[PDB]
């Protein structure tokens, strides 16, 4: 007979007893087992081809993508503990700011600034939701996939906060057309038209290393600095205490996505030529992120200073990774 093991056979010999994280997240994708024929069917279906083209054949290379570990070590159980806690905090804020009548106290120029700069963001957030959900279904290791996992449910979290506040805001200001106009603002407004082309175009980069870089490394920071950091700085000096707080609460999600991106980038630099592969993709996409961030921040109060801080905080993200 084969003898009973202390852990799984793929974790045997670690010096150290595997964690719940490793126990439930590692070495779980099985399409990577037969690269010449991912799925147990004919080797020429479109999805066999999609997966060989965009997963296996990606210029970003490593011998062992299953060695990756999410530095926050999230599993589903932990993720709901953390986010039920964060949402008690954010729903408490909605509850109690409403009780006070916070929305009734905002100036009319602010109300108008929300309608144009704040609530159409439901579209930009659903889009990074899709973007990160694509990364999940093409990444080469289940521990990578899991990070896009929890990140996607965060993007849906921000969509959600927005749907809700946008309704609260139409209740207070039935004539602004909150709820009715975001699609147009998103479709037609110049302040939106650099983000929109950054993400419509990034949403068709199918190479898992290219989707990664463009969603995580370049689009999400330009979106986070424009929409969380600078619209919520602006909210806060403008009297909108709720958005100010909201945005900093969602930035907590964004910093976590960055901790895992930064770790993946670390693991990529182990292999020669990966940096160059990644620097080339950043340089493809960065110009569209500079467009985004100029169209947006320029239309905001204090314009050029918003542009300049967003551009360099966003770029300091990637700086910090090599």
Q: CB of 229: closest distance to another protein in angstroms? A: 22
Taking CB under 8 A as the criterion, the residue among 17, 35, 39, 259 binding another protein is: 39
Binding status of residue 201 toward another protein by CB under 8 A: yes
Q: Smaller CB distance to another protein: residue 252 or 275? A: 252
Taking CB under 8 A as the criterion, the residue among 75, 222, 242, 295 binding another protein is: 75
Which region among 109-117, 198-206, 246-254, 292-300 touches another protein (by CB under 8 A)?
Answer: 198-206
Residues 119-138, interacting with another protein (CB under 8 A)? 122-123, 126, 129-130, 133-134, 136-137
Taking CB under 8 A as the criterion, the residue among 61, 93, 197, 313 binding another protein is: 197
Taking CB under 8 A as the criterion, the residue among 17, 53, 167, 259 binding another protein is: 167
- How open is the CA angle 94-99-100, to the nearest 5 degrees? 105
Q: CB of 243: closest distance to another protein in angstroms? A: 17
Binding status of residue 267 toward another protein by CB under 8 A: no
Q: Smaller CB distance to another protein: residue 121 or 217? A: 121
Q: Smaller CB distance to another protein: residue 177 or 322? A: 177
Give the count of alpha carbons within 13 A of 233, CB side only: 15
Please compute Rg for the chain using Cα positions: 22
Give the chain's end-to-end CA distance (angstroms, integer). Answer: 50
Binding status of residue 36 toward another protein by CB under 8 A: no
Binding status of residue 233 toward another protein by CB under 8 A: no
Taking CB under 8 A as the criterion, the residue among 67, 204, 283, 320 binding another protein is: 204
Which region among 150-158, 226-234, 236-244, 246-254 touches another protein (by CB under 8 A)?
Answer: 150-158
Binding status of residue 98 toward another protein by CB under 8 A: yes
Token look-up 């993200």 returns 317
Which region among 194-202, 222-230, 245-253, 273-281 touches another protein (by CB under 8 A)?
Answer: 194-202
- How open is the CA angle 280-286-290, to the nearest 5 degrees? 165
Residues 280-309, interacting with another protein (CB under 8 A)? none
Which region among 3-11, 220-228, 245-253, 264-272 touches another protein (by CB under 8 A)?
Answer: 3-11
Binding status of residue 156 toward another protein by CB under 8 A: yes
């Amino acid at each position: 007979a084969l003898k009973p093991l202390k852990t799984w056979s793929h974790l045997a010999g670690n010096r150290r007893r595997p964690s719940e994280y490793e126990v439930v997240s590692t070495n779980l994708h099985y399409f990577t087992d037969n690269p010449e024929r991912p799925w147990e069917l004919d080797s020429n279906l479109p999805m066999q081809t999609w997966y060989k083209k965009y997963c296996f054949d990606s210029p970003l290379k490593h011998d062992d993508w299953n060695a990756f570990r999410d530095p926050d070590q999230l599993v589903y159980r932990t993720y709901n503990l953390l986010q039920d806690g964060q949402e008690s905090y954010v729903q408490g804020l909605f509850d109690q700011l409403n009780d006070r009548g916070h929305d009734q106290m905002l100036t009319r120029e602010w109300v108008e600034t929300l309608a144009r700069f704040y609530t159409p963001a439901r579209y930009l957030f659903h889009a990074l939701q899709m973007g990160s959900v694509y990364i999940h279904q093409i990444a080469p290791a289940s521990t990578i996939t899991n990070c896009a996992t929890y990140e996607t449910a965060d993007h849906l979290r921000w969509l959600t906060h927005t749907a809700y506040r946008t309704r609260e805001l139409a209740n207070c200001y039935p004539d602004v057309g909150f709820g009715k106009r975001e699609r147009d603002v998103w479709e037609n407004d110049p302040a939106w038209q650099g983000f929109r082309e950054l993400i419509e175009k990034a949403l068709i980069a199918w190479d898992w290393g290219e989707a990664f870089t463009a969603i995580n490394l370049v689009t999400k920071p330009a979106v986070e600095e424009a929409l969380l950091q600078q619209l919520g700085s602006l909210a806060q000096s403008e009297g909108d205490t709720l958005l100010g707080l909201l945005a900093q609460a969602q930035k907590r999600d964004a910093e976590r996505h960055r901790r895992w991106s930064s770790a993946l980038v670390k693991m990529a630099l182990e292999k020669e030529g990966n940096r160059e592969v990644l620097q080339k993709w950043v340089a493809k996409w960065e110009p569209l992120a500079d467009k985004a961030i100029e169209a947006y921040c320029s239309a905001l109060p204090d314009g050029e200073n918003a542009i300049v801080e967003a551009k360099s905080a966003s770029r300091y993200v990637r700086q910090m990774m090599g």
